[PDB]
Paper text:
Kainate receptors (KARs) are L-glutamate-gated ion channels that regulate synaptic transmission and modulate neuronal circuits.
The intermediate resolution motivated us to use particle subtraction in Relion to independently resolve the ATD layer and the LBD-TMD assembly. After subtracting the LBD and TMD layers from the particle set, we refined the ATD layer to 3.6 Å resolution, and then did the opposite by subtracting the ATD layer and refined the LBD-TMD assembly to 4.2 Å. Inspection of the conformational differences and the measured RMSD values showed clearly that the LBDs had ‘open’ binding clefts that were similar to the antagonist-bound LBD reference structure. This shows that GluK2em subunits form an interface between the two halves of the ATD layer (B/D positions), while the GluK5em ATDs heterodimerize with GluK2em ATDs which position them at the periphery of the ATD layer (A/C positions). From these measurements we conclude that the [name]/K5 LBD layer is more compact than the [name] homomer or GluA1/A2 LBD layer, and in this respect is more akin to the GluN1b/N2B receptor. The antagonist-bound structure is expected to feature a closed ion channel; so to understand how [name]/K5em restricts cation flow, we visualized the pore profile using HOLE. This analysis revealed three constrictions on the M3 helices at T652/T636, A656/A640, and T660/T644 (GluK2em/GluK5em subunits). For this analysis we considered the correspondence between the pair of GluK2em and the pair of GluK5em subunits in the [name]/K5em TMD and measured an RMSD of 1.5 Å.
Author numbering:
A (entry chain B): 33 to 397
B (entry chain D): 200 to 248
C (entry chain A): 21 to 408, 416 to 501
Amino acid sequence: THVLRFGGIFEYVESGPMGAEELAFRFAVNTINRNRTLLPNTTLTYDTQKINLYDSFEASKKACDQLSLGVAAIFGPSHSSSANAVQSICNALGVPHIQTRWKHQVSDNKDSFYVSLYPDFSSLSRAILDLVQFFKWKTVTVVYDDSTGLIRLQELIKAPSRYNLRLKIRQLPADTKDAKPLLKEMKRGKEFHVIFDCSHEMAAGILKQALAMGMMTEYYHYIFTTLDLFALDVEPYRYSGVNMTGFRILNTENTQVSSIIEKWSMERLQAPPKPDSGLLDGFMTTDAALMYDAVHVVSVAVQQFPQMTVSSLQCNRHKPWRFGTRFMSLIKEAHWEGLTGRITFNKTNGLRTDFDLDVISLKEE
Amino acid sequence: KIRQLPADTKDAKPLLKEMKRGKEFHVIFDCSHEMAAGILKQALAMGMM
Amino acid sequence: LSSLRMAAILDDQTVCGRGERLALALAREQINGIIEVPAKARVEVDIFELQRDSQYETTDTMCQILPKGVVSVLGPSSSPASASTVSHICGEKEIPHIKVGPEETPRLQYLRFASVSLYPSNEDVSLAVSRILKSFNYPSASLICAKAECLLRLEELVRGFLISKETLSVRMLDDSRDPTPLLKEIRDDKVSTIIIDANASISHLVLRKASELGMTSAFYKYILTTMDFPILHLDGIVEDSSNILGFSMFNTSHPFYPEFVRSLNMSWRENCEASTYPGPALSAALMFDAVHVVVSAVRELNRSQEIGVKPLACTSANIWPHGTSLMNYLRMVEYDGLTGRVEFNSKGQRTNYTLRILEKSRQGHREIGVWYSNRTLAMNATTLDINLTLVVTTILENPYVMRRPNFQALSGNERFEGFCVDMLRELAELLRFRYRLRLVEDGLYGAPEPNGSWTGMVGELINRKADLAVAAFT
């Protein structure tokens, strides 16, 4: 068959031999090999290299190896430093890097050959800000994880310049899990309305230790900002009467999407997690859905581009890829109905700032 | 103000909801400690701790 | 023990450069000019330029330097992404990094700490601006970050303040690099202290349009957080009282500093005649202190054992054998150079160093004291500059202040006669300060009124129009 060889650079998550991201990438390339509408005349084989965590130099060496193998895009990684390295190893050689998680963008960067797919956190923070204006708040308390900075919460921070807010910023203890003295100072300082900012494992941790601190009452109100709020387990907090709201980007109410959530978690392709942790079981998390959608929309851009072959690209030494610039215009131009919603990029800077959210909240059911 | 634990179960969530909605703060429980642990777990899940 | 090779990675331009080539050539000149006994390890420093800030090209440059038998790398000056690539490459090859640049990347501890940093920490500069604002008695300040990275560089300042429009409101310059709308929001939002974060040219544009808005007189206190402050030139904005603070890191008592600035002054004119030489770039001084720190620590290493330098390759993973030992000998060293003291704590940051604080004065700068690494700030070391004719408003009511025959100069002298006129005459004749009269704006004594402010002469005082309202106000 006609050959096309994507590539992935994934990170060593030791819950199994393959993390959720690489599981989603291999599962997704299997379903696009199988569906004979999306690319019936080609075959997506894929070269997947697995790097350690926080290794910019190992990532780049791996990516130059993939580019030597000859590749037609590069998916992942998800950490900011290694992602930045491989994004410029691509911007150089002219192959489309397709991010999946939110990297920290350097504003002076002139890289044109990248497409992010996590919804851009400026526009997502505008959504958080419209929730803050809708609940008519004054005394917000942003609580951010220090794995990233405030740079993605720049719109919440620039918010009290142009509104009437009082936004006290506090920082989670990054080295540990127990948020006990933070939550104690939060309760003592009467900081009721709290915007969290953390990955959903951290969100389950702070919710459990907010329950044991007794900060789960009628008063408190936790706007989460991870897109995995629905994959929390709200069974211990369902009755207390917290209004914890948050955003959801998966199309779980659509049938063709929920069938693939089921086909994901009906044989435990998703790795079996710790059920005593606090997040639920048998779900497709947002990162896995985003990687699924990533290789879907890149497959679409291959279908709009017939004659494109895959060229041997010698790293740290030579030309750009020939077909890559037309290919990259095609990926940025591409449009897809996927599990994340619709998918179309802001065609200037490659980010994704046009999408449908779903404001979910905790009611008694 | 007297109220009564439903003895045929430990599903005292409607009683705890009535005590919360009626703003009954100070409570003298009267039960054996198995029922006391049960009602304490229920009142944690009810958010009255 | 052949010699001491090093690596310079630069982010300057050949013409009108910040001058890192001249700095490191001057430094190699100086430490080769030290005549030790015996004819010991003659220091060379290799220049490796780096055109655009891009992690791929940095990786190419680093891959060239590692086989050249480097003992420690330093630079790049003003490219943070290139700095992070250099840092992780040399941290996996155990070549010591000496970061002369700032930290705009989110620094993670899982990225290993094989990287000392001569440039003071973002957390330290944030603590310095927070202690300056404490010693202004916490005024309702306002940041003007040039780029989003300001929030990373001032993380501790932002999260140590209740972000609102009365304690700290953060405003960010837009893609246009024009500061007038957010300066206008600052003016009519009634805020005084303006913390400007940016490089020299963008802070220059903000302060120039701040003067061309009228916000430069002694009401406004500007705190510039560029540690490349004193190379600025605010001619036309340097006023009689302008409160333009700033930080600086030069022990100008240093015995090399005048010939340092003289050599860079000469080699600026020769390289380009674009403008005057604005003073030494902090990155140039930091590169001088950097190569001195490397030479002192490696001479301490060679004084205790023998060092060995082997040409490493980017492909394979030959770790340098003396990585942790040179890291300990680096993070123990103390230097006394063109950034004050160079002593490092455990993490490889900098401590026991003194930030001079400058104020933009008549021709250049004039200190408001120092801010130390640990302890608080002595705002009175040169002197504490809290110490930084009048207008006489009157109604015209007979017989208290009666108008004279209004043909001659009825202003100052002839403006009236009567008990008020001689009253203010004798009053400031005693209190010895000249003040010119002016008839009132409304003609009523005025009332505190329901349009927000007062009416008449009351509002004429209250809106700070004139100075002393010396007339029969009840």
